[PDB]
Design a protein around this ligand. Structure first.
Ligand code: HEM
Ligand code: HEM
Ligand code: HEM
Ligand code: HEM
Ligand code: HEM
Ligand code: HEM
Lengths: 146, 146, 146, 146, 146, 146
């Protein structure tokens, strides 16, 4: 894939500061779909507002985990089947905790939003399409699990 | 069930003032999912904002009805099969008016939110888990209807 | 004042259920001006969302207090100078806790909103103007205090 | 259908200024379901806020297209099978771009909202029911496509 | 002023469709400051949500009036003292209806937002600064009135 | 001051990760007062949504600056007059860019919110009061400038 280098080059920016960038992704996600806020429950409490999630060490650690799994997809962008079973197992964990398959698009839109805002003019049409394809391949792998 | 007493003890607080507590539950529900606001249409009009629903006698009467059905679940917590057909009939009514099965989780999260906020430190881990199980049993009964 | 009976007649509806109606007024107030939410701090904690305030016994008791002071204005609508010093003392308490004079209009708009929604077609033009005048007279009395 | 004239008479108001009215419909749609905002992507960019969509010529042109297709349904209200294949083809296009069948209700609620707000007292019970039936027939035609 | 041509050239875009552009400005204004929504009251009713304002013929006519007064400022950009008394009289009307001097900045930010979104890359730094200066001169003229 | 150690001890938590904590403070600030979003304009563009600010390197650098100035107040908590002229000069800069004195309370509430959420049960009554006093002393110093 020639778009493998578009993904690698565009991820370098974000990968140097994964929590700041992941913070944009989750801020966007809760602005688009605040009904996902209750899925993140730590110490038996529900976040009242999206800004409450940003004060939780557990939640910020969850952001870091998400960013490491996207980073792994980037590392394996030229295949992606090297991570197939890890992603199917990650999908099984999602279904277990009550996440719906239909919510995948909103997370993808939040990731694309975060990339658009970080790269500016460098988030070219080809770069956008390459990320949509990567994300789609990741979600397909995770979808085996429902 | 030993958690039957956790449910009964925790419901006494809320059951003494069902409209105030139900008001928290619906306020939370519309904050998490404002797309449910149009399902409550009285006198051929749509609520523009969540606060509009709180001014409607019909809507507040709907809150009271919801709270009485949760109260009935509490009264029958040691079985729950005593209410099985009433709940299946309630499920049929829901499908009829356009409510989706997928919205059950958001209502459950709103109920758990209302209980967390009312009980504070008394909403222990065991109490939380007991309510999730009760609510799950109620939704399972209602789900026969779609 | 002939509008004294418009105020008395229109207040009877609301006065029979002061917490439900006051709940609409404060729900509207926080929807219009969420920056007022932090002024209501009980047990050293800030409400994260407007729906959090509706779960607080202290806050609901504050609503009841507000509704009793509007009720007192209605009781004294034919004069209003009978309550002048009580209202000036209430104004002093407001300035003390950090409330700004400029926020009076938003509270007035929330009260008028609550009355419009409760009375429907009975909230005639004359009724609206009578309430605006009463509220203005109340705020003038309270404004001595800043 | 006798409600054919209720639909025609009520549409004349809106049809004279299709962009202003369509603007209400989409403003309502994004207020109820902001997660639909990312589906409208032009020039490789995502709208950050609903008000951003109203500044986009492409988006306003999309509103005009939607309003012309509702207008065509009105023109063919006495049958509706004259437009069956056009609507099935429109449904296929929707599935292609990632729109879910479940989102149809929210668009219907936004259309009914726009009609209620435009007609006021002229949006009688019979008029409301006639539009719900028309919209339902349109969505049924479009649903063949998923 | 050499920035007189930057203002004239940038206004031509917007002036051809004043209601669509004014709609962006007011949508932005209510998103930034929803407490201004109650100031626009027609037929003795308050808008519950910003989208309600967009359904009101009176409100859309108010948008057109605002856009004509900005257009007049553009027409007189090389002086602006030709409109001094009209603007002072407009300021007096504002104070009368309860608008605060402090709200001028938010309206200016909404206008600049609308211009940024309409012009894109054509809303250069010099164009931005020229509009800020024009708007400031308009508000100074209107401020005599409080 | 004995509350000097309450401030120092409570700041250690936050001072180790100033951007994450500052991010909570600004997220809260924009949730309470979205009309402050346009004051942060970089590269001649306005943030459409609060989440847009979190993607801006300039804005995140502004957060770091704010956190360093609060850190300086903590370092000088036993006097605070050691920073008097720096703070008066910072106040002059604020007035210059259009910030209002009245917005100080909302920033203080956002800071207290961030501290409450970071410390949990360690944000005792005495700790809360100590921070309110420090913040008040800072704002008093900055207020010379308007
Ligand atoms: C369908 C949309 C999604 C939703 C609603 C969702 C939500 C969640 C939730 C609620 C958790 C558990 C939180 C906790 O208990 O700490 C979680 C875990 C996680 N998510 Fe997602 N998620 C979605 C998609 C994704 C995607 C697309 C990825 C990246 C490939 C991802 C990466 C992760 C990771 C790495 C974890 C930690 C799993 C573990 O505990 O081993 N998620 N997600
Ligand atoms: C799936 C999530 C739900 C949604 C979206 C929903 C929505 C609705 C709606 C729109 C109505 C009709 C309103 C009216 O016309 O007055 C209704 C009725 C009602 N709901 Fe729900 N509901 C949900 C779940 C529940 C649950 C979990 C309970 C409690 C077990 C419940 C209790 C009731 C009751 C008691 C009624 C009145 C039924 C009757 O007319 O006989 N609902 N609900
Ligand atoms: C200017 C707009 C207003 C704001 C921001 C405001 C806010 C507040 C706050 C923050 C409190 C103290 C809460 C507590 O510690 O429990 C309070 C108390 C109160 N307010 Fe207001 N208020 C406003 C106007 C009014 C008006 C117009 C009335 C009715 C005439 C009113 C009636 C009351 C009453 C009766 C109390 C309780 C006072 C006491 O402790 O003795 N307020 N208000
Ligand atoms: C299920 C709810 C719906 C959603 C989420 C939705 C969303 C969309 C989207 C994302 C597009 C493409 C935008 C673009 O690329 O410019 C579109 C196109 C369109 N929609 Fe919808 N839509 C829905 C239902 C409807 C309905 C009920 C109608 C009217 C019958 C309608 C009329 C149209 C038309 C006429 C187009 C242009 C199609 C073309 O490119 O040929 N949509 N819609
Ligand atoms: C300070 C911020 C402002 C606020 C809160 C505000 C609000 C209002 C309100 C509430 C009205 C009366 C609505 C009605 O009854 O129909 C009005 C009228 C109007 N405004 Fe503003 N406005 C502001 C600034 C401006 C600016 C900067 C301009 C353009 C120079 C402007 C142009 C107009 C015009 C032309 C009218 C119609 C006046 C008339 O009745 O003769 N406004 N405004
Ligand atoms: C009154 C409420 C406040 C508002 C609305 C406000 C807003 C702003 C704005 C708009 C800027 C300039 C942004 C830029 O161009 O990058 C700024 C700068 C700054 N603010 Fe605030 N601010 C407030 C209070 C405070 C407080 C209480 C502190 C901490 C003591 C603070 C610390 C700073 C610092 C350190 C800077 C950078 C100044 C420089 O350029 O030298 N601000 N603030």
């Amino acid at each position: 894939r020639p778009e493998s280098e578009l993904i690698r080059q565009s991820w370098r920016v974000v990968s140097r500061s994964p929590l700041e960038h992941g913070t944009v992704l989750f801020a966007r996600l809760f602005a688009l779909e605040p009904s996902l806020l209750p899925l993140f429950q730590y110490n038996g409490r529900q976040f009242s507002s999206p800004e409450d999630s940003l004060s939780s060490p557990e939640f910020l650690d969850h952001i870091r985990k998400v960013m490491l799994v996207i980073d792994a997809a980037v590392t394996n962008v030229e295949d992606l089947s090297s991570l197939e079973e890890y992603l199917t197992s990650l999908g099984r964990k999602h279904r277990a905790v009550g996440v719906r398959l239909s919510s995948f698009s909103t997370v993808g839109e939040s990731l694309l939003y975060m990339l658009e805002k970080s790269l500016g003019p460098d988030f070219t049409p080809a770069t956008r399409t390459a990320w949509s394809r990567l994300y789609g391949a990741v979600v397909q792998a995770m979808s085996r699990g429902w």
